[PDB]
Ligand binder design. Structure first.
Ligand SMILES: CC1=CC(=O)NS(=O)(=O)O1
Ligand SMILES: CC1=CC(=O)NS(=O)(=O)O1
Ligand SMILES: CC1=CC(=O)NS(=O)(=O)O1
Ligand SMILES: CC1=CC(=O)NS(=O)(=O)O1
Ligand SMILES: CC1=CC(=O)NS(=O)(=O)O1
Ligand SMILES: CC1=CC(=O)NS(=O)(=O)O1
Ligand SMILES: [Zn+2]
Length: 257
């Protein structure tokens, strides 16, 4: 089964998921000088004030903070998007070392980690239907660099010991995802895919220009998570990122000059 090890990592995924070599795979390198400023791109509308977080889960590949997506409580609109996309979960990808960890890169630079806020297009009715459509998901990607602590991240970091191993979950109510956003909502956007199997080509990627800073202690605690289940040999959950994939016949657009 797929993962991030030497024998089941990203270079093997195409054998079970041939779309891994498809025409709109993610992540990609964002070449800042080649991205095209599009003055017609609207500002992003991030409406998270009514968000209802529920639970945090170690799924063996990352951890997901899950939200109530049965109503329009936390929605992403605007930018390149038509219609309304509901927040279903967020998760991160991170490295074994501060020098790597992000999935998208910027002029080939790898950040320490990358946050993915996952939203599905409400016109399809649920996430399972949305992933089958070329405009089914909108993922807000936010880079993490190591520096000052991110206060709005600490409640996540502090609960990780309760979900150390694959299959563990914990209550995670009353968490405010607005605390994970940078100041600016300037962004790049392009059509892409899920970055894990099944790698479906259903994502409008919206990658924020401005990273958030997290402390070395915060990212160190991510690296204490385990890919394995309890009672199995310990394998640290680190380097759970897919490398940049060929851009092929796509142009990255920028919301900002
Ligand atoms: C390095 C590694 C990563 C993974 O995803 N699965 S594994 O626990 O078999 O080994
Ligand atoms: C150019 C570049 C290459 C790489 O792999 N990691 S990095 O973050 O040092 O930046
Ligand atoms: C994942 C996790 C993070 C932490 O802070 N302590 S712990 O090593 O018990 O488990
Ligand atoms: C659920 C989900 C799966 C994935 O692989 N990429 S994503 O960031 O769109 O979120
Ligand atoms: C719900 C689930 C199924 C899917 O299609 N992609 S995912 O593996 O990211 O999560
Ligand atoms: C897990 C651990 C335990 C503690 O008490 N303080 S700390 O935040 O430095 O790291
Ligand atoms: Zn992701």
């Amino acid at each position: 089964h797929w993962g991030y090890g030497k024998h089941n990592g990203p270079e093997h995924w195409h054998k079970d998921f041939p779309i891994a070599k498809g025409e709109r795979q993610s992540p990609v390198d964002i070449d800042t000088h080649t991205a095209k400023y599009d003055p017609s791109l609207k500002p992003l509308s991030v409406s998270y004030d009514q968000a209802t977080s529920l639970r945090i889960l170690n799924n063996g590949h990352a951890f997901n903070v899950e939200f109530d997506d049965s109503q329009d409580k936390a929605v992403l609109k605007g930018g390149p998007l038509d219609g309304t996309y509901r927040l279903i979960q967020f998760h991160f990808h991170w490295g074994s070392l501060d020098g790597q960890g992000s999935e998208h890169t910027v002029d080939k630079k790898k950040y320490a980690a990358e946050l993915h806020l996952v939203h599905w297009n409400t016109k399809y009715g649920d996430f399972g239907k949305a992933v089958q459509q070329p405009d089914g998901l909108a993922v807000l990607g936010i880079f993490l660099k190591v520096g000052s602590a991110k206060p709005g991240l600490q409640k996540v970091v502090d609960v990780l010991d309760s979900i150390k191993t694959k299959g563990k979950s914990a209550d995670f109510t009353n968490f405010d995802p607005r605390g994970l956003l940078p100041e600016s909502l300037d962004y790049w956007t392009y059509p892409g895919s899920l970055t894990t199997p099944p790698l479906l080509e259903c994502v409008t990627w919206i990658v924020l220009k401005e990273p958030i800073s997290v402390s070395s202690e915060q990212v160190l605690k991510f690296r204490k998570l385990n890919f394995n289940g309890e009672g199995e040999p310990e394998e640290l959950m680190v380097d759970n990122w897919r490398p940049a994939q060929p851009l092929k016949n796509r142009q990255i657009k920028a919301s900002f000059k």
